[PDB]
Structures are given as C-alpha cells and as structure tokens.
TrEMBL record:
Family membership: Belongs to the protein kinase superfamily. Ser/Thr protein kinase family. CDC5/Polo subfamily.
Coiled coil: none
POLO box domain residues: 16-117, 149-223
Range of the intact protein held here: 1039 to 1261 of 1265
Organism of provenance: Trypanosoma congolense (strain IL3000)
Protein name per Swiss-Prot or TrEMBL: Serine/threonine-protein kinase PLK
Signal peptide start and end residues: none
Length: 223
C-alpha cells in the first residue's frame, strides 16, 4: 500500500548507522557516520565513553563528553541535537572542538580525508556499511538538520553482528546476512516500529523475531 510505504520511508529516513570502522588506533575505538557529511568518533574516557560528530560542510561539531548515564529526562528538544537523553550535549565550532578533543579530532580528520581521497578515485569509504543507506546520493544534510550520535556499541565477539544504540532511541543490528534488524524505542522502554531492512531496499515488519539473531544479540548485551 501507500500508507505503509510512506510510513516505511519515514522509518528509513532519519539518522541510522550508514558505515562504521573499528580501529587499532587507541584514542578512538570506532569511527562512524549516521548522516551524510557527518563523521563521528566513539571513544573511551577515564570514567566510561564519549563521542563527537563533525559536520564537514559547516565545521560545527557535536561533543557529548559523558554517555555513562541513561537518564531520559530531557524535557525540551535541543534545537540542534536529536537526543532523548539528559546528558550534556555541546555544539562547538571546529577550533573549540580541537581544544577539547585533541587526537580525537585529528583522528576524525584523517578518517574524513582518507574517505575523500578514495571518493576522488570513485571508491567508497573503507568501512563496514549497513545493509541499506537511505538517500544514497545525498552528500550533505540540509543545514538545520539536528545531529544524532552513537550511544552504545555491542560487537559480537564472534563477528556475526554489531548492535548500535543511537541518541534518537533507535537500535540497529548490522550483521552478515545482507539485512539490518532495526527498531524504534520510546522512553518508557516500549518498542514501536521494527523491520528487517534488506539489501534490496525492502523492509519487512516483524513482531517477535524468529531468526534467532536477536536472541543471540540479547545474550551479548547482557554479558
């Protein structure tokens, strides 16, 4: 139908993991992009985890220094950050970001620049991609586009998937059978829309997951 296909395109439309890369660099554990033109570092802090996202067209940078509390008591929508979490979120120009991020910003810069060198040769980012990227031609997000970030990363020790939790309360399993398993949660811990998003661009709804993949993902998250 149409109501479904339009509701599906809405689900496919926001910030999702487009690609990511783990490292052997020590400062950043993971580079990623959730929105065209925006490149993030997911990194350890003395007390836990932090992240930052650089928009390469505007050179404005989201900085989330602490993601170690899951409080969803953010009353009002932040004007530039799509997040339902109470944690402090900062928007900085690139040079203020450099002062606080150091090697992390350098790392993001080298990630961006390598991607651009590859693109100049017609080659994609050297990174693990999701099974599907909405608006594949899109190279930059409109200016007023709110920033989203990665909050949690759960890689399968056996390499079969990675689970991501995002600041917009979306969850995304990227796995090795040419589909993602995606869903939207709310703040009272309910799950709304959820789909197998297939490499052919199709999306199949499910209620309970019969594939066994989520049951295995679940065990990894609890460990």
């Amino acid at each position: 139908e149409e109501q479904r296909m339009r509701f599906v395109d809405e689900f496919l439309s926001g910030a999702w993991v487009r690609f990511y890369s783990f490292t052997t660099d020590d400062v950043v554990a993971m580079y990623y992009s959730l929105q065209p033109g925006r490149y993030g570092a997911f990194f350890a802090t003395e007390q836990g985890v932090g992240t930052a996202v650089v928009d390469v067209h505007s050179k404005l940078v989201l900085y989330v220094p602490c993601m170690d509390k899951d409080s969803m008591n953010r009353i009002q929508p932040h004007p530039h950050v799509l997040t339902y979490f109470e944690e402090d979120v900062q928007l900085l120009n690139i040079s203020d970001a450099q002062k606080v991020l150091g090697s992390v910003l350098t790392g993001i810069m080298n990630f961006v620049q390598e991607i651009a060198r590859q693109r100049g040769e017609g080659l994609p980012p050297p990174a693990v991609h999701a099974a599907y990227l909405h608006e594949r031609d899109k190279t930059a997000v409109p200016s007023n586009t709110k920033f989203a970030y990665v909050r949690k990363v759960f890689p399968d020790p056996s390499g079969s998937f990675v689970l991501f939790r995002l600041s917009n309360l979306r969850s995304q399993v990227i796995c090795n059978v040419l589909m993602d398993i995606r869903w939207q949660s709310d703040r009272q811990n309910n799950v709304g829309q959820r789909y197998y998003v297939l490499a052919d661009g199709t999306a199949e709804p499910f209620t309970v997951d019969h594939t066994g993949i989520l049951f295995e993902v679940d065990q990894v998250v609890r460990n």
